[PDB]
Design a protein around this ligand. Sequence first.
Ligand SMILES: O=C(O)CN(CCN(CC(=O)O)CC(=O)O)CC(=O)O
Ligand SMILES: O=C(O)CN(CCN(CC(=O)O)CC(=O)O)CC(=O)O
Ligand SMILES: [Cl-]
Ligand SMILES: [Cl-]
Ligand SMILES: [Cl-]
Ligand SMILES: [Cl-]
Ligand SMILES: [Cl-]
Ligand SMILES: [Cl-]
Ligand SMILES: [Cl-]
Ligand SMILES: [Cl-]
Ligand SMILES: [Cl-]
Ligand SMILES: [Cl-]
Ligand SMILES: [Cl-]
Ligand SMILES: [Cl-]
Ligand SMILES: [Cl-]
Ligand SMILES: [Cl-]
Ligand SMILES: [Cl-]
Ligand SMILES: [Cl-]
Ligand SMILES: [Cl-]
Ligand SMILES: [Cl-]
Lengths: 411, 412, 411, 407
Amino acid sequence: AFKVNQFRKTLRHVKNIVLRRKNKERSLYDLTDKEDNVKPKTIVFESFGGKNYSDSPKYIYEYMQKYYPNYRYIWSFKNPDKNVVPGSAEKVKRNSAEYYQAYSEASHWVSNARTPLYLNKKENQTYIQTWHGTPLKRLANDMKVVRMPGTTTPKYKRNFNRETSRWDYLISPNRYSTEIFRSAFWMDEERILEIGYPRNDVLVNRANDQEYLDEIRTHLNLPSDKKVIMYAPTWRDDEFVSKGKYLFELKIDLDNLYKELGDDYVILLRMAYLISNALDLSGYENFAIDVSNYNDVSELFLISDCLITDYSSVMFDYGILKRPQFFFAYDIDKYDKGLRGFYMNYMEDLPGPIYTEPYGLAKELKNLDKVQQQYQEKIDAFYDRFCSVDNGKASQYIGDLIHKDIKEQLE
Amino acid sequence: AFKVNQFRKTLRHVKNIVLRRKNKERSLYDLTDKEDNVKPKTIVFESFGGKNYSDSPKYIYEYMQKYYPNYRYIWSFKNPDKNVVPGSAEKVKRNSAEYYQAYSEASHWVSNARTPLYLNKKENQTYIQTWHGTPLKRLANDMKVVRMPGTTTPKYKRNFNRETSRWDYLISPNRYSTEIFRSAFWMDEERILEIGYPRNDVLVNRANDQEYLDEIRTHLNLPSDKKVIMYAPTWRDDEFVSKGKYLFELKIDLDNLYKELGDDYVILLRMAYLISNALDLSGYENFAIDVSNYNDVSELFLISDCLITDYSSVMFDYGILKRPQFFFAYDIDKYDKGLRGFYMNYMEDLPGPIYTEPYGLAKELKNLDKVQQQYQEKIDAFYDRFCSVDNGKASQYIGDLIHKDIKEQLEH
Amino acid sequence: AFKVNQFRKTLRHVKNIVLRRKNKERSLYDLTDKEDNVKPKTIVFESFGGKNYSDSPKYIYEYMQKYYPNYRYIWSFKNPDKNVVPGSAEKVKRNSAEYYQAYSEASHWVSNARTPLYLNKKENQTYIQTWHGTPLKRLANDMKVVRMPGTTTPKYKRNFNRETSRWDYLISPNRYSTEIFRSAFWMDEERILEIGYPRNDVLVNRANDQEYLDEIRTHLNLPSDKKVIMYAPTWRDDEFVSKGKYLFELKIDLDNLYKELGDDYVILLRMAYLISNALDLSGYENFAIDVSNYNDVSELFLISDCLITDYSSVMFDYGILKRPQFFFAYDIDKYDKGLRGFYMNYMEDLPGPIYTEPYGLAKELKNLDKVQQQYQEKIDAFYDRFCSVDNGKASQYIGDLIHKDIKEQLE
Amino acid sequence: FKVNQFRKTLRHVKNIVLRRKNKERSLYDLTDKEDNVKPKTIVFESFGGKNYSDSPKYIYEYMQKYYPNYRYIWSFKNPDKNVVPGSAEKVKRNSAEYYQAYSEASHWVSNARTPLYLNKKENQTYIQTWHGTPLKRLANDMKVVRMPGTTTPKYKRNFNRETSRWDYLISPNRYSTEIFRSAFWMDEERILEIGYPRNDVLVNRANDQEYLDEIRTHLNLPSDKKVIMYAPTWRDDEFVSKLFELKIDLDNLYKELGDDYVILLRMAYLISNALDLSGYENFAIDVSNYNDVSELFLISDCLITDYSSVMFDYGILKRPQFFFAYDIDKYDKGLRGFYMNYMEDLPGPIYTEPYGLAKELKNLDKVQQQYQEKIDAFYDRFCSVDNGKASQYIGDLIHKDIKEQLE
Ligand SMILES: O=C(O)CN(CCN(CC(=O)O)CC(=O)O)CC(=O)O
Ligand SMILES: O=C(O)CN(CCN(CC(=O)O)CC(=O)O)CC(=O)O
Ligand SMILES: [Cl-]
Ligand SMILES: [Cl-]
Ligand SMILES: [Cl-]
Ligand SMILES: [Cl-]
Ligand SMILES: [Cl-]
Ligand SMILES: [Cl-]
Ligand SMILES: [Cl-]
Ligand SMILES: [Cl-]
Ligand SMILES: [Cl-]
Ligand SMILES: [Cl-]
Ligand SMILES: [Cl-]
Ligand SMILES: [Cl-]
Ligand SMILES: [Cl-]
Ligand SMILES: [Cl-]
Ligand SMILES: [Cl-]
Ligand SMILES: [Cl-]
Ligand SMILES: [Cl-]
Ligand SMILES: [Cl-]
C-alpha cells in the first residue's frame, strides 16, 4: 500500500516532531506538498534569499501592484518585521509554516537569487528567475575550482544544476550574458528572456525626471551645489583584520579627495556591509556620505555624475546612462596578473581608464567633461555591447507574462 | 530520561529493514551494541581494509598462534573464501552479521590501516594500530589540499582525527616517524610504541636462513644462476589511459634491461593491481617476473639483491637489509620541481642515486658491488636513522602486550 | 544502557504512523509525555467520558471560574462543537493531539467517571475523581460475575483496580458510601474527601430561590398552576425489542396518569437515550414532557414535588430535598426475589412505598401531603443516613483544594 | 510493500532486539512461503509433544516399513528424553528446526490440537486422528467454560479456527462422526471412519501369545496370575497437600484377589508419584508412566474404569468391564453432559462401593456371561468399525497424496 518515497519522508518527520527539531515545519511541508495545493493567483516574491525588499523582484512587483491588485502577493523575508513592503502583499518569515504554505500554494515564484532545493517547484508552477547582473567573474559551471568549506566543486555544481533545471524563465540583460548563461547555467536558449533587468527600468524611464532626482538627493541630505561621485569597490578577503573593529583608511585616500574635490564634489561611498560599520567618517561630513545601507542601488546611479568601481557587475548597470566610469584597481596584479577568470577583456573593452594609484584619478576627476569627451568612444562601445537591450519595460514584460500564464491556469 | 540517541538508531534501523537496505546488519549492530558484549579472549585482525592475510597483523597473529593458542581468533576479509588463513582463526566477511558480532565481542582490534567509523570502539576494548610504513609523502593532518571527490579537506581531516583518537596504541619504526605521527595523527607520545613493524621481523630474524630463502625462490620459479633486482614504483594517476587495456611499456624500458642485465639478473616487477594485469611479459620469460600479487612483500625483500623505487615507503623497510637502492624518478620534474612535500630531503639523504633516465641506471646496475661501496657511506647512515629500531622481536612485543592486557581483564 | 520501555513505544508509534492508524496521536503522546510537560496552572475537566458539560466537574469548573479566573481551563468532549461551555475554558476533542497535549500538561484532572488507562497519570499530576452517585447496585470489586463480552471477571476487576489506584482523591457523599468505596474501589480512607457532591450543591443552596425555580420552569414551557412529578426508571435490557422503533407504552400507563392527574399535575419523563426517541407523546402535550436530554438533572430535582424511580442512585441525591418518593418496582420479581445485590435493604429502609402496579400509585399521587406525612418519618431517617453531608459547599472545597495544591507547586 | 509483511517485520525487529524467545517464531512467520513445502516431508506429533505414542505412532511405524523413502520428522517438548525407532529425526518445540519442519512438511499428522501460530498453507494436508470416542462433551457442544484467562466465546472461536484446518479427521464410529460433525464444526466429507490407528494392535495381536509375553515380562508380572487394569480419570476435587489411599481399597483387593490376580494401576501423572505401594509389591503394579496403553489393554482380563473414553478402546476385545463410580452423585445426579446414557448402555455394572466389585471380580467367567449381552451391544455400537488396518489407511493415503504433488 505504501510507496517508498512517502515512507522516507514519513520517518524524517517522525524524527523532527519527537526530537523537537526546528525543521519539523519543513518535513510536514514535504509530506503534504501536493500538486493540488496551487492557487493560480498566488505569486511569491523574494530577493537575495530574503535579506531585502529590493531589486528586480521589487519592480516586477511594484508594476504588478498598479496593474493587477486583484492577485495574492506574498513576499518572503529572513526577518519580515525589519522590512517594509508597499501595497497589498503579505509577508512570511523564512522557514515558518506560512513560508512553506506560500511556496506550496503559489503558481509563480519570482526571484533574483537561488531558492533552496528543499522546496518543491512542482510541474504545476512557474519559477521566473531574474538573477542579479551581467557577469564579469565566472560562475556556476564555468568555475574551475572552488575550495568552499563544506562543499566540493562537483557537488557544488551538481547542486547549482539541480537548481537551474527548475528555472522556467531566466532573464538576460544582453547577448553577452545569454551566451554566458547557456554554458554556465546549463540553460536552453528557449527559456532565456532577453528583455533587460526590471531593476534597471528606472535608469531608462527617469534619467531626466528632476522632481525625482531631487527626492533622492534631499533624502540623503546632499548639498545643493555639489556634483555626485559614487565609489563601489567589491569585497576583498584580504583586507579583514582584528575583529573587524578598526579598519585602515580606504586606498582611494579620502583626505586627498577632500582637498582636490571638496569644493566641486561629494563622494557616495558604497562599501560591503563589513567595511561600512567600521568606517569612521569624522570630519568628512558633507563630503563622504556613507551609502552602503541604502535599499535601492538604481536610485544611487540616477543621481551620480560618474562611478568609480573595480571588478563589479554594476559597471554594466550604470552603463545604461552612458556616464563616465573609472576603474580603481589598486590590486590588479594580485588578481592573476592577466586573468582570464573574466568572461571579458578587462584590460581593453571597459568604458573608463584603469588606475592603480588614486592621485591621477583625482586629478582626472576634476574635469568630468574632458573624460566624457576623451572616453565617449569606449563608453558608447560599451553601451551597444552590454546595455543596448533595456526598454524600461522589463518589469512590464515579466508582470504581463505572469498574468498571461495565470489566465490560462484559470480554465 | 528520554534517550535521544537510542531513538535515532531505532528509526534508522526500522528504515533499513523496511527498505531492504543492505546496511540493515550494520544498524542492528549499532542499536544493540553493549559493552557487556565483549569477551576478553576474542581478538580481531584485519589487514588493508580486509584485502589480504598479510603485513603486520599477519605476523602479530602468527606469533600468537604459537604462544597463546587458547584465545578466540577472528580475521576479517572482503571475500573470506579467496583468502587462506593458517591456524585456528575463523574468518568473517565484511558488513555481514558475523563481522559485527566479531567486532562487538572482541577485546582487541588489530589493524594496519583505518578501520571504519561506523564500528563502535567501546571504552571496553583496545584498538591496536600498527600502520603500514615509514612516511615519506605527508599524510592526514600534515596535508595541505585534498581534492578527493565527495570530501573536503577539513571534513577529511576531521574524520581521520576521529579515527586516530580511537587508536589506543600506535606502532612506530623510528624516532623520525614518531615525531611525525604525533603531529600527522594528533597522537600523544604516551600511546606510541617505537618497536619496529612486526612485518619486518623476518628482515632481521631470517636474513641469512639459506633454506628459507630457497623456498621463496623456487616458489617463484626463478633461475638458479641469477641475482635479483626488485622494482616497485608507486601508483601514478597520470599514466592511466585507454580503459587499462594496453599500457605503454614501463618507462624503465624492459628491452634495454634485458640486453644489459639479462645474463646476470632477473627483475621482479611489483606494480599496482592495475598496471599488473595489463602487462604483457611475452618474451621476457625467466627475466621479467610479474610479482605484483605475491602476498608477502617482506619475503620478496629477503631474496632481493637490490631495490629500485621512486617515492615509496617500502624503501625504509628494505633499508633494514643494508643492500643497495636505486631511485628511478623519471617524473621528478612533474612533482613540484623542488618538493618539500616530503618529510625528508629527498634530493640528498637517501641510500642510493637518483636517476631520471633508465639507461644509465641499467649500466650502473651491471656491477652491484661498486654501488655498494660507493654508497656504503649513505646506506649505513640511512640505516641508523630509519632502521635502527627494528629488533626482530616486534610481533612478540604486541603478542605479549595483548595477552598481558587480557589477563588483567580476566579478574576484576 | 538500553532503555527497553522506550524502544517498545518507538516501534509501536512507527507502526501506527506507517499503517495510517488513528491511534498515531495516542502513541506519539505515550512516547513523548514526560514529567516536564506539566504546567501547574492547567486543569482538565471531563464528565461521563466526554458526553456532556454537566455534573460535578461542571459545578467545580463554574466555581473556579468565579474565584480563580487566572488558571488555564480545558474541557474534553467526544464532539466539542456540540457542547457549550460558559467561561474561559478551551474544548479539546477526545483522542486528538490537543486532547493528549491537555492531559500531558495538566496538574489536575477532574472527572466523575473512569478516565482511559492509556493516559499516563504522572506522579506529577493530581487526579480527582468525584464519581457520580451513592451506590445502590454493587460495583467494581464487590461484583460476583461480569459476563460482559471480550472481558472476563478477573480481567475487568484488574483494569478497574488499575484505574482507582490513580485516584489521588475520591469524593464520597456519606459514611455508607465510604464504607463501600473503600472496598469496591480498593481505596484508602485517607484519599476519600467526604464532602458531598458538587453537582448536588444547588439542592442545598437554591431550593428556595423562587426566581431560579422559574427560569427552570419556563425553560421547559411548564403550565403555571400544575404541580410537577418526575419519573426516572433505570435501563432494563430485557425490554429492548424491535430495533428500538416502537416500545410498548410505559408500564406506568400514561393514558391513566393523564385521566387521574391531568388537571393538577405535569409529569417529567427522564429515560434512557433509546426509550426517549421511541416515545410517542401525541396527545399528552402539556402533560408528559420528555425531559431525557435535559443537561442538568439537579435543576429538574429542584422543581419536582416528588420523584418516582425504581433502582437508581438518583433516589439518594433527591433525598436532600426531603420530598416524597415512590418506587414503581413493577418488575421486582425478576430481580432475584430477595436480592442482596443491593448494598442496602431495599425492601425496608427507603423513603417511600414500593408499588408493583401503577394504579395504587396514581391514586396515592393524588394527595401528596398525605404521602408526605405518612413518610415524614422514613423520609427524615433516610436524609440522616444518605444526605446529611452535603453543605452545598462541596464544589467549593474541591476548587480550593486544587487552588491550594497549585500554589504549593509554584515554589 | 504489503501491510501484512510490515506488521510481521516490525514484530521480529522487536523480538530480535529484545532477545525475546519468540524471535524464532517471528522469523518463521516472516519467511514462510508456499514454496518451502517439500512433498516428501512428513511431521508427526502426539499430545502436543509429550510422547512418541498413540495413533501418530502407529501411522509412523507403518510408513517406516512400506515407505522408508520419505523424510520423517517428529516433534517433542524434550526430544532428548524420547526414543524414536527408524529413520525419523526429531525437533524440539519452538526451535528453529521445529518451525523448519512445520513449514516444509506436506503432511502434518497429529492426535491433538496443533498451535495456531503455525501456518497450515493450502499447500499442506493436515491430518487429525484425535484421541478417542467422546464421553465428555467437547468444543462447540460445551455449555460453559470458566477456564482462567479465557472466555467461552473466545475459546470456541479459537477451537473453530483449529478444526477449520483439519483436512482429514479420523473417526472410530458413526456415534463419533455424529458428534464431530457438530462439536468440531466438521464436514462429513472430511471425516474418515476407519477406526483408530492405535487400536490396530487390539485387532491384529490379541491372540499373539509371544507378543503378549514380551509385554507381560517387560512388566515383571507373575505367570500364574490374571490381570486387572484400573484407570480412574482425574478429579480436581481430590488434589491436596502439595495422598489418601484409593477409594477402591487395595488392602481388600489384596485379601480377596491377591492369589489369583495382579492389578495394574493406571492413574493421572499426579496421583502416580503420591501413591505408596510398599507391601503390595507383586500385587499392585504402578503402570501410569507406561508409554503405550494398547499393550496394557491387550494383556488385561478386564478393565475397571469410571468416566473415561478408554472403555471405548478396550471394548474392541469384548472383555468384561466394571465401572467404579464412587462419586457418581457429585457428577450432576443424572448428567446428560454425556453423549451417551451412562446409567444404561455401557458394557458393565455400575458399582459405587468397592466390595461387591471385588466379589464379582473373583469369578470373571460368570461376569463374562451375565454381561455377554451388553458387551456385544457395546462392541456393535462403538467398535465394529475397527479393521486393524487404520494405520495402513492413513499411511497409504499420505503416500497416495504425495505421488500427486510429485507432478
Ligand atoms: O531514519 C532516519 O530518520 C535517520 N537516518 C536517515 C537519514 N535521515 C536524515 C534526514 O533527515 O535527512 C532522513 C532519511 O533520509 O530518511 C540517518 C541519519 O539520521 O543520519
Ligand atoms: O501486535 C503486534 O503488531 C506485535 N507486537 C506488538 C506491536 N507493537 C507493540 C504493542 O502494540 O504492544 C510494536 C510492534 O509493531 O511490534 C506484539 C507481538 O509480539 O506479537
Ligand atoms: Cl487561485
Ligand atoms: Cl571470554
Ligand atoms: Cl567470499
Ligand atoms: Cl570518535
Ligand atoms: Cl608493495
Ligand atoms: Cl527507541
Ligand atoms: Cl503554569
Ligand atoms: Cl465536533
Ligand atoms: Cl462553548
Ligand atoms: Cl453509582
Ligand atoms: Cl405510554
Ligand atoms: Cl497492502
Ligand atoms: Cl511473534
Ligand atoms: Cl521432496
Ligand atoms: Cl487437544
Ligand atoms: Cl492456518
Ligand atoms: Cl476424547
Ligand atoms: Cl494406597
